[PDB]
Amino acid sequence: ATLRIGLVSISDRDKGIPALEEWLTSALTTPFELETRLIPDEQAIIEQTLCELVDEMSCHLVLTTGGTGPARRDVTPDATLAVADREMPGFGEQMRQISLHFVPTAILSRQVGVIRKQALILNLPGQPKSIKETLEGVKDAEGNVVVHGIFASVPYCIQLLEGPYVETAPEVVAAFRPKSARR
Amino acid sequence: ATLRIGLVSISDRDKGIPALEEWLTSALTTPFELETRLIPDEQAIIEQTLCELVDEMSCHLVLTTGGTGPARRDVTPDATLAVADREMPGFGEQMRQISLHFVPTAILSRQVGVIRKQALILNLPGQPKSIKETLEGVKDAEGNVVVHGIFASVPYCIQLLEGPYVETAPEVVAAFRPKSARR
Amino acid sequence: ATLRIGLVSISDRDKGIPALEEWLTSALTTPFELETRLIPDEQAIIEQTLCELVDEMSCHLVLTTGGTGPARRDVTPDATLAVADREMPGFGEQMRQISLHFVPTAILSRQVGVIRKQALILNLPGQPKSIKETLEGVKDAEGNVVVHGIFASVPYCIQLLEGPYVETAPEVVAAFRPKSARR
Question: I need a labelling partner for C122 at 20 to 30 A (CA). Which of A102, A171, B41, C17 fits?
């Protein structure tokens, strides 16, 4: 089936939506449709937007960009936890470990991954290069994986959440699944 | 003294209890006694079982297997946090980092380690191979430790919780303790 | 400007204050002033002390030492979360990953990093060697960084919190900042 993805760029004031549209087009080999939103960094508007995308637009996956640091105005993770049914602690932890391979200041991000209804919501960085580094991971000179991107586990997570069967281009990111889940 | 260990296999429907009984028999060199329970994946029955083992059976350690993923029915970590007095964030984090050496999808687990009364409760995976990988860690071809298993810190944690003095077979897992705690 | 730092040694009963005074003197090249407190391990007195330092003494940074393990009396992280406006999950996670390079029992620490008002509060270990290992990280024989210390991100975090411009001696720890924040 078609994967319905919501893309939310949270601007304190856009490069965020465009970076996601480009990366997802290169990575996915199964069909997808986008619902894109560019909004201010105000917590109640981020919460409303996430509920709109999950509840009224029926998105299977929502990726946010921006507003995850320590500063007073950065409230994207707070809005995401407010609308969640359940937290996925491994996603925050591992997005920080992937990002620490690039710079030590990755530990200042408060990004989370949560589930609302059957949708997965992931908070990504505001800079385009960081968005791609997080999703795809760290490879060597010959292209071999050193540390898997966070997207390597997203297709199987959507499958466990009773969503569509998603596949990726192995040259960009390989979609890991156990024998029990492979078609 | 004898270490009293509770083993809980949480079945959505058993290989879980048997994998733990085998590993603990190979790893521990001090005496232990087991209290084993096989139960359905229903949150209130998991909570009741954990309270039974800690409060009425006086277990010093409880190890659970199964029901820690993202799917709607997996509620083992929710039950474990509900009965906890305190969380041990390092145990969830490091069980995920150990498991990431094997597969990238380890970040989909929501496993926790908590304390109830003076007992330590740890959530482990449902598959037998994963149970052993988590407890014992990653070694090289000659058998040298690369990343310590989660059990390397359990004997000292039980000692700090005023429990019995536990020792392990160094060929399986070495029990780390500071000078202040060594007998 | 002058950085105002609070140092809190939480004694269950001192080497903690002195280890911090020595390390900060070697690491910082911009001016700082210290507010030092030696207190018992009782949760309400730790909470009061942290509020005193942030609210009445206007500290930009507070570093605590001691009382972060699993034992019943170790309540430094509980007091720190009680007085927080917001948690910084990356600081707890990465202090544990840095400390795991030395010993596997680092996962028994429940240390956190939080923000109260515009101040950053970090929980460090009770042993002097561990305090320095956490702040400065892991280097090789020639002095090159393997894993950055937790202090490499503190100057930029204080800047994002609208505090003074802090600089460090690169021979001890290099202060990472993006192009947007460098003067």
Answer: A102
Least Cα distance to A4 among A65, A52, A66 occurs for: A52
Query: Distance between CA atoms of C115 and C50, rounded to whole angstroms?
Result: 11
Cβ–Cβ < 8 Å for A11, A40: yes
Q: Provide the edge-to-edge strand list for the sheet that holds C3-11.
A: C32-40, C3-11, C61-65, C119-124, C113-116, C86-87
Angle at CA B117, nearest 5°, toward B113 and B88? 25
Token pair 């409880």 in the structure block, residue: B62
| A88 interfacial to chain B (CB closer than 8 Å) | yes
Contact check, Cβ <8 Å, C70/B157:
yes
C-chain CB neighbours of A93 within 8 Å are 89, 93
Taking alpha carbons only, the member of B92, B78, B67 closest to residue B12 is B67
Two tokens at A116?
Answer: 């609302």
Phi and psi at residue A89, in whole multiples of 5°? -60, -30
Specify whether the CB–CB gap between B102 and B133 falls below 8 A. yes
Would you tell me how many other CB atoms lie within 10 Å of the CB of residue B106? 23
Decide if C10 contacts C39 (C-beta within 8 A): yes
CA A131 to chain centre: 9
Experimental method: X-ray
Report chain C's C-alpha Rg in angstroms.
Answer: 15
Best probe of the C interface among A12, A87, A103, A107, by most C CBs < 10 A, is: A107
Torsion of CA C145, C149, C153, C155, to 10 degrees: -100
Residue range A1-183, CATH number = 3.40.980.10
Nearest-angstrom CA–CA distance, B28 and C163: 52
Q: Residues of C with CB below 8 A from B122's CB?
A: none
In a mutational test of the B interface, the residue from A95, A148, A168 whose CB has the highest number of chain B CBs within 10 Å is: A148
- Tokens for C1? 């400007």
Least Cα separation, residue A3 to chain C (angstroms): 31
Amino acid A18 reads: P
Which residues fall within 8 angstroms of residue B47, CB to CB, at 6 or more apart? B79, B82, B83
Contact A88 B105 (CB under 8 A): no
Question: Where do the structural domains in chain A lie, given as residue ranges?
Answer: 1-183
Give this entry's resolution in angstroms.
Answer: 1.5
The rounded distance, in Å, linking the Cα atoms of A37 and A131 is 17
First to last CA, chain A: 14
DSSP C85: S
CA distance C162 to B28: 53
CB atoms within 10 A of CB B158: 20
Q: How far is A12 from chain B, CA to nearest CA, in Å? A: 30
Q: How many residues does chain A have?
A: 183
Calculate the CA dihedral of residues C28, C50, C89, C97 and round it to 10 degrees. 60
* Alpha carbon distance C97, C91 (integer Å): 10
Chain-centroid distance of CA B78 in Å reads 16
CB B143 within 8 A of CB B169: no
Q: Tell which residue, B18, B21, B49, has the closest CA to residue B33.
A: B21
